[model samples]
Target chain A: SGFRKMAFPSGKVEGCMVQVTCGTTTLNGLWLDDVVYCPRHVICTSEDMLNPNYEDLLIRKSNHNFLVQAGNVQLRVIGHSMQNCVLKLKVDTANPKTPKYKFVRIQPGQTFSVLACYNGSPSGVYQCAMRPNFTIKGSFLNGSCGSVGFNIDYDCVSFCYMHHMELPTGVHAGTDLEGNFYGPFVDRQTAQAAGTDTTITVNVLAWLYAAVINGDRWFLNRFTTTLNDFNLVAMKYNYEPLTQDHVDILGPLSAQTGIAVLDMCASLKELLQNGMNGRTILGSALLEDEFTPFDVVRQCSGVT
Target chain B: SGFRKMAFPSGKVEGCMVQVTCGTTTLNGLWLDDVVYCPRHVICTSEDMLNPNYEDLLIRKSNHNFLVQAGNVQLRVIGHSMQNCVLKLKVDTANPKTPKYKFVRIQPGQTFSVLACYNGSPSGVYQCAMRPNFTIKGSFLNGSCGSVGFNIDYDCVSFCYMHHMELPTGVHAGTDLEGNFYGPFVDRQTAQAAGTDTTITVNVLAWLYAAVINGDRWFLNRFTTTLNDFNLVAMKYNYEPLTQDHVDILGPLSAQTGIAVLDMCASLKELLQNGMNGRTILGSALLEDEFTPFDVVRQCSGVT
Candidate 1:
């Protein structure tokens, strides 16, 4: 795998691509695009501070109703709660002395405002990671997020990357997951001194991966802010939350086939274990350009 | 992938004895014991550490949870609150789009007892690669745990693992499943009717049996599960979902069991034929472990 600079009418863009061959013989994949594909700039948002009624999230495509080309959705971060928090899941649950987690902590406590905002979206917006009493934070995104502005959402010119915000100097407005108040513990020692258990932490890379994948919802509710701050509203055409790892694992896939959790996880089985005869459910049922619900459910009667 | 055991101060332990043959073959698998379907040394754990309730997770296999060895319950790592903490499910639910999950995020909280202790016991625990709840994390697990001595409880000595535990650093305890409190809202279920498989206690088991025989239920609820799981469930009764292996292996053995036991692998399609098929009848009878109960056999051809 290497970065390949490709030609685009707009300009030259850089994206990662991987090539595989079994010595001489090549392999064909479930999706045709698997043969060749690119990672485009995709704008994603999660209600971080909210949860909708749908288990499988809804993607806002070209129009309110189904319109133009729709993409596929992978259950990027199925369980949203595990987002920023790292879980040391090992095979052995019996040995308490075994270190499931390596001890280390990120510099905790960030500056912030009192008004709550979802991923820096707006005052009242909620986010699972963007816990706000007054501060805004991530708990991770991607390399090319800046490169293509992740395919700029419709009203994204209205939003700016939360991390890019300029500091107002001296303002502390809230408590955090560690329960530290404004201007509280900035260093590991100080943070620990202030009664921080800091053990439960998030892997920024993994978190970022999930963030980008599950980030679609952030594009849903739109809000505006400081003139310089971009107020972005991403409209997805068949956007299903898919993790970056799976995206990379799934290989060169076009964004059209909304991912099905069942298919993706099942696929994970195949990838992790490779070939062994057992049983595998079918793969993506994505139809092109249509509303990509990936809707080919097996009814109680067992038919699509 | 075969057993690998090295020496330490802990005494001599054996991992695997990977034996291979040029008999021209290579096999891949998701499980280690699965490498040769043989068992050696495996460390496990139980949640003697914390619990919010739904406790009783501690089991000693020869003692365990949900059921007996229940064929080594797969720590499904469902929904991963981290689908985005995890949903514990034996079967999948329907209405894929209609979040079977309530949209309300739990009141997000946790009260835990720290010290890492295996389920108050000394043996049996396997976690799917779930990283610890601290600083860095990822991936998933399954197998022996070797880490910190987590806080523990009693009777765990006989327990195989901790399905529940106590947390020390606390709540945020860290996750909110659809935002329910403590945990998420769960569903509870019953009954019998004519035309139903009376031999099968629950309708679900019966339906699942059909699903294995037929591919339609492959998408049961929204999981990519296997009929083998259902098959194993049937094993408690000495009833096994008959497979071609059983057919071949049992063909001549019928003489050993007398009554000219039928071949086991006759497809379910053949089983439903109602009378002409001896193999199907014999297999179903074997699955049930008794020919006497076979009198109530329902025609498989009937609509599910």
Candidate 2:
């Protein structure tokens, strides 16, 4: 893929566009440092902060509900105190492990990339990679008798892109998926640490490719959530006490449908496995915007 | 479908064989009064009982694990007293309702079809119908100073058909889905009350039809059970206390995988919907034994 400068809205900071090659086809993607580029998926951050007290490390102490587009979330830590302090960072998630804590000792002048949040091999001093949709919590414990403090920076800016084919019908898009954008920097703070170029490009082809993947993943996630909800409500209803009258009138029907729903879960899972077919790469026929749930289900229903 | 008498194994009662007509095809099924016919799905019942006291009505009080093969379970109630008594019956199911109770009034010489276990518009005195995989519970209460007593007969026998094509290769079949068998008897006691005809036929075509449907439903039930088990285990894992070190190492991975499983649920549901395609009929292509899980999943993975 190659990139070139592109026109922007009047008075807006102009950005570069990347042309991504895809099997005899190409797509244009934009890369801008603007957080408001995508409304559905916004880039959020805790902002840079230094010398936070012990209590500032609490997860709730820090803002929760940080919306993350589909990509990695970044966390950077810099030791500011002459004495070392134990830094603890916690992330809240469904089914969080109890007694969850990760303590890292830090000393003066030592900066650690707590979470580079990228896929593949670990990169950075801490060798940490984290996923999106995680609420971060942190704290400081005195490693030495002397006072302890540090600087922490966090943000979500995985992909940014735009195109000027904009007059009558133009295309400008971005992604929540983390960019495979590579450079000399092992961590995102390479711009500040190395004092090199800050310009980066978001491959439109890869971005679009990920969108298809994300869309599929998202659909599955929604269905799981729905089934889980149904299971929960059904169980809750089961837990509630019912008179014999209700049992006589409703119990049989409930069992009938309940069994069917559970059966549905099984069939759906089977279909998913069929769809996945142990293959990761989606072929041409499985391209974006062409996926129809109805067609796939009809076919599978017959087979399953 | 048609039926003919068939030879029986040595020392066994002779039974009839049924010929089911499918689209451009025919299949043979077995019909035997023997409860030992199909081991996977066994026919069970609470033998004929008359004038039981209040304590006899409890579900736990009666044998509960009455194995019911894939068929409608019958519950016949006969009122023998001049006064009426409230008869209550309950079926245990997941997510049972609150205030669970059903009070059925009975009087002298009056018979009520508590549960015909059929699938059409309500039939018989109570217009009652029920499904399989249900445990039956019952109780009785005083309706007047006069002693209230009645006979209760229950059994599970929806389909019975066999074929002489047996020697080396033979066919005998039944279904869990209630047979669309239509006769003058609204309830199962037609033989005892009418004393006209005891012989009946089981449609091999429909029996095989239900077998396919049952197989599909059973597959789904298994899958749902598996998913539910996973959800349960995952939640259990999440609920267990974890050391900070463990949390540090395990929390993020759990969240990532948890989200993925949920996503799987969603995608599976979508695939099921696709397979269903708003159609009730299973076409020729979807004939029995042709279902393949891998192919369906692979296809769906791409589209989803």
Candidate 3:
């Protein structure tokens, strides 16, 4: 009844490689405990860590125009740890006659880092296949992580991942510690296909965000100018007769889709208050008799 | 059948005292002829016309604050034509305690003037009542024509009957063409009453007019200043990271209410249409952006 402590190798190891070995020889019937592998980092850097044959590798850009350069291309990996993993990279340049690099293996400890040799052109997202082999239950096991049963498709220019937190339990350490190992964990690729559809959600959200900011700015500008104009017109005709027809025309326009009179007055009061001392622009006295013919017209027309 | 034309006296005839005759004739069971009273001419040279009694006459100042002297008021008749003529002068004043004068036996072609001594106090309004005392074949007759009313409510004022037109088939002749024989016309009495009432109505109306004019002026001025402020703010934040919230808060207040947003733009458009030509301090490109979180806050909160 004791905790088992395991230690692994650390330090800046190079050669586009990663190695893992458990210090604990026997981990609770978990023999051949765990293995570690690295696929060249592809999303943010562009140094190819893996030197693999390009014959079977595929590389293609999505129809969405993405700027990619020979020495600037990269891949990103986002997932739980994998051991003794192998992945193939291919470029589909929209031209079947001449495909770019084909079937390039990712180096260990490096995600996806490949340099284009011939200005590769791809019209759509690329695909990758991951293969892993290990010993589980003292039996040699071999399987393709990206087989007919587990396919991976990603936009070449952008890649992302979705991670979910393990559920919490009520018994503190009992449920929070020992219970942490409970429940099933599956890779995004193995999750329900429909559940992995993040493209539509991300794009839709982005579009909505863009629309709101732009739309409000547009409307607000219009609203302010309308208010100013109303003030000017009202002033000009202040001395003249306040005809009901004139009020009828301007009243609704002033009230519609913009600042209300009271709010406008308040804002004006604020501005005036800020600008001048001891002199307030809007007060009860000013507003008391501020009836234009609009009130009469509305009353006459029985409009509220 | 031959027509006969009758001639009577016409001119600026004047006398301090004189006798009048009804022409001593009758025809067809009717008087056939009637006597008429003309306004008395107060000779410009008569010192008596200038001399007024300081007491006994109601006196008040003119609305325009002009000094008026009215006194020595009396009602009297000179001679013969008086037997058939009766004159009634109604003096309506704001003060009822003052003596009222009515004329009886007023003669034709005779000067009948009110003589009053003034200590520089004006008199109210006075109207001369002209009633006839004759009948022809069961038809009534009216005597005093060309008789006018005078008002001294605020100051000494008089009303002269305008030239008359021929009577219609069903109408009588003694009445003025406009129909009223006894009038509360635009004499001193009406003007004085107007003076009192005008204070109430004019005060309210004046304040209202000022509110419209001054209010509009204030709004326009503040609008211009706010627009300038918005431009300054936008320029300050240009090429800066404007979060959705930042845009929401500042965009409407600065851009929309100011110059760069649609509200300001539309306001300018309307102002221009209203014959306002001014350079816009803000341009749209600077304020244009995606809808910000502030917009949602404003819309949901019904910000005005």
Complex DockQ per candidate:
0.02, 0.01, 0.00
Candidate 3: tens digits of C-alpha lDDT, residues A1-304: 0000000000001011111111211000000112112121111121221332211121222211122122233222112222212111222221121111122222111111111001121100111111111000000001101111001112111111101111121000000111111123211123211111011111111112222222221112222224344444434423222233333343453344244433333333333234222221111111111122232122112120
i-RMS for every candidate (Å) is 28.5, 35.3, 55.9
lDDT for each residue of candidate 3 in B40-103, tens digit (9 for 90 to 100): 1110112222332211111221222111111222222121121111211111111122212222
Isolated chain A TM-score, each model: 0.17, 0.16, 0.15
lDDT (Cα, 0-100) at A82 in candidate 3? 20
Ranking by lDDT: 2, 3, 1
Candidate 3 RMSD computed on C-alpha atoms after optimal superposition onto the true structure: 44.5
Tens-place lDDT digits, model 1, residues B1-304: 0000000100000111111111111110011122111010110123222222222221121211121011123222112111222222221122121211122221101011111111111111111111122110111111111111111111111111111111211111212222121232111101111111122212222322332333222222222223464355444433334444433433333332221222122222223223222222111221221111111111122100
Candidate 2 per-residue lDDT over residues B235-270, each given as its tens digit: 432211212332233233224333222233332233
C-alpha displacement of B152 in model 2, angstroms?
36
lDDT of 2 by residue, A1-304 (tens): 0000101111011111212111222222121322111111111121211223322332333222222121132212111111112111111221111112122332111211211111111010010111111101111011100011111211111221111111111111111112211111111121212221110001111212232322222212223323454334334422112223322332232243332223333333333334434222221112121112211221112110
Better of 1 and 2 by TM-score: 1
User: Of models 1 and 3, which has the larger DockQ?
Assistant: 1
Q: Evaluated with TM-score, which candidate comes out highest?
A: 1
Model 3: DockQ against the native?
A: 0.00
Q: Provide the clashing-pair count of each candidate structure.
A: 134, 62, 72
